């Protein structure tokens, strides 16, 4: 565990940190710079000091909770106002102005007919 969530043992550090919601490759590299470990390491072999350096760096960064809250609350907000994007969120249709005549199936689900 690092940020209240497990991470793989056999994946290296830079990659394992990416299995948090909120933390990607860039942030992982920058975190490992700040809490200076090597990227080659693997968390089955890391020590208490290394792991705690990392935890200390990670605590400053919104992740595994507040990030889900930010996203959900932003969407609920734009729905509570009768906005275009929030109408689209309420209907299950694309938001960025794609065309729904064809090829919108991530937001529409599979083919219904």
């Amino acid at each position: 565990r690092i940020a209240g969530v497990d991470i793989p043992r056999e994946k290296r550090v830079v990659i394992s940190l990416t299995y948090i919601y909120g933390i990607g490759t860039s942030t992982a590299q920058k975190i490992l710079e700040e809490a200076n470990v090597s990227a080659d390491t693997r968390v089955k072999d890391l020590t208490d000091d290394e792991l705690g350096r990392i935890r200390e760096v990670v605590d400053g960064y919104k992740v595994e909770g507040d990030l889900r809250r930010e996203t959900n609350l932003n969407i609920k907000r734009l729905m509570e106002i009768s906005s275009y994007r929030g109408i689209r969120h309420r209907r299950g249709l694309p938001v960025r102005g794609q065309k729904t005549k064809n090829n919108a199936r991530t937001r529409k689900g599979p083919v219904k007919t």
Partner: protein, 59 residues
């Protein structure tokens, strides 16, 4: 407690090295145990936590 079916439930130590809170109690764990977060290191107990108008005024 029947002799034959219950585990080895022995007294161990819970160390929150983040804030070094060293608590003693039992476990079936198999003596110093590692814990990262706790009632003395977790936000909600400790009470310390880490707007379209104010946003638009800065710009």
């Amino acid at each position: 407690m029947k002799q034959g079916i219950h585990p080895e439930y022995h007294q161990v130590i819970f160390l929150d090295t983040t804030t070094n809170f060293k608590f003693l109690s039992g476990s079936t764990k198999t003596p110093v145990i590692r814990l990262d977060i706790s009632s003395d290191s977790h936000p909600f107990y400790t009470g310390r936590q880490k707007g379209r108008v104010e946003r638009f005024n800065k710009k």
